[PDB]
């Protein structure tokens, strides 16, 4: 049962600096080098470097070296790596993998640790309803735009409209976040019945109920 | 400091053999290189498949293998099955540094293709009252996960303003993404048809709309 457990989500900003865990279980931690990798959109994937728990021995890469630094814990079977004068470079997923020496490369994976380096502040979001231009189905929908960060929350009908919802994936759009979601209902369910779409963005706590009528 | 290159992407269909390659720049790659082949899932889930050029990780199925193919390291996967879609990603090591690949993202066709639905809305009134308006393009059961977004006002291409979401999984299995033109009122109100165009495994699907 080898396990490599890494700390969650990080949200920083530019200048700071983060403290990423690997906690390792189901094996001898110390008998291990763990391995540092960052992955960033466009960039493929990046070795940062690594460290053998039992010796404290390390390897750079020389790209890394005055950017991380690893630490490791026999007693608490964790490893970390720190990251130093934080910048939107350094935007991205890191893991933590292990290396076992006869197999001559990394078996076990952590999930991951999301670290976005950003100085944006908090923005709620502005919902307008998305009707059709005026089938047996209609479609429906709501736009979220400009919120910060993400993510956002949306129902339908106070969740009384599951099935034939749609919500998509954000995109960002100069900076903010941007979201839709629909709902494909009966032709005649609609504008005969209400269809109400509400959005809830934690982060500025803002919640919003939009009816949609026809245009 | 190796590159080292990769397919970028591959498809196959279940129960097919495919065979993925790693290239580096600095010549061929040997045994000294421990070829590693890692395998990434949705929602950045990773394992290590292959160590050492041919070494199989433990309780990686046996359909998964390495080896070098010419002056090339190589993984080999039997008997595809639709759970072995993920990014595939080769490292190997040289001067001292451990270089990954590209990775290549490989497509195992489980289901029918399908073309997408496309979905046009026009801005708010409320939103068109900011001075603001955004068009929605909704694109949804679509198969394989992958397409391309084009709009047109009056005939004409326009991408400024434009974005365009990663296709995500449906709970259908299908996948679905949307599109956005955003412009100022005053120049939503310089046009008169908008169109959002999705092109789909050489097809394209078309909505259009007129503002008036
Ligand atoms: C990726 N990383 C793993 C650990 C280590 C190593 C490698 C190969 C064979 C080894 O026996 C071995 O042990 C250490 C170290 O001595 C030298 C290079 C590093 C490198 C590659």
């Known amino acids: 049962e080898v396990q490599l457990q890494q700390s969650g989500a990080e949200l920083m900003k530019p200048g700071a600096s983060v403290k990423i865990s690997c906690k390792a279980t189901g094996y001898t931690f110390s008998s291990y080098w763990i391995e540092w990798v960052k992955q960033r959109p466009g960039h493929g994937l990046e070795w940062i470097g690594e460290?053998?728990?039992?010796?404290?021995?390390?390897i750079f890469n020389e790209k890394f070296k005055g950017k991380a630094t690893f630490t490791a814990d026999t007693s608490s079977n964790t490893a970390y790596m720190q990251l130093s004068s934080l910048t939107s470079e350094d935007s991205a997923v890191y893991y933590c993998?292990?290396?076992?020496?006869?197999?001559?490369?990394?078996?076990?994976w952590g999930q991951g640790t999301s670290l976005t380096v950003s100085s944006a502040s908090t923005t709620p979001p502005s919902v307008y309803p998305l009707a059709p231009g005026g089938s047996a189905m209609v479609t429906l929908g709501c736009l979220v735009k400009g919120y910060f960060p993400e993510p956002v929350t949306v129902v339908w009908n106070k969740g009384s409209l599951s099935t034939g919802t749609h919500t998509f994936p954000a995109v960002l759009a100069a900076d903010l976040y941007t979201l839709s979601s629909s709902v494909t209902v009966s032709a005649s369910s609609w504008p005969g019945q209400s269809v109400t779409c509400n959005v809830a963005h934690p982060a500025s706590s803002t919640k919003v109920d939009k009816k949609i009528a026809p245009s | 400091d190796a590159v080292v290159t990769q397919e970028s992407a591959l498809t196959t269909s279940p129960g097919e053999t495919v065979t993925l390659t790693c290239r580096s720049s600095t010549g061929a790659v040997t045994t000294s290189n421990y070829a590693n082949w890692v395998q990434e899932k949705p929602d950045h889930l990773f394992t290590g498949l292959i160590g050492?050029?041919?070494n199989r990780a433990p309780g990686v199925p046996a359909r998964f293998s390495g080896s070098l193919i010419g002056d090339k390291a190589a993984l080999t996967i039997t008997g595809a099955q639709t759970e072995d879609e993920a990014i595939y990603f080769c490292?190997?090591?040289?001067?001292?540094?451990?270089?990954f690949g590209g990775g290549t993202k490989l497509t195992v066709l489980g289901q029918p293709k399908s073309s997408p639905t496309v979905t046009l809305f026009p801005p708010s009134s409320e939103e068109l009252s900011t001075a603001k308006a955004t068009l929605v393009c909704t694109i949804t059961d679509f198969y394989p996960g992958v397409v391309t977004v084009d709009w047109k006002v009056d005939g004409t291409p326009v991408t400024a303003g434009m974005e365009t979401t990663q296709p995500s999984k449906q709970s259908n299995n299908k996948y679905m993404a949307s599109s956005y033109l955003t412009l100022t009122a005053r120049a939503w109100e310089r046009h008169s048809s908008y169109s959002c165009q999705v092109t789909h495994e050489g097809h394209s699907s078309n909505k259009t709309l007129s503002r008036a």
């Open positions: 993998a292990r290396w076992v020496l006869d197999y001559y490369g990394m078996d076990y």
């Open positions: 050492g050029t041919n």
């Open positions: 460290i053998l728990p039992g010796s404290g021995d390390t």
């Open positions: 490292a190997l090591w040289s001067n001292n540094k451990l270089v």
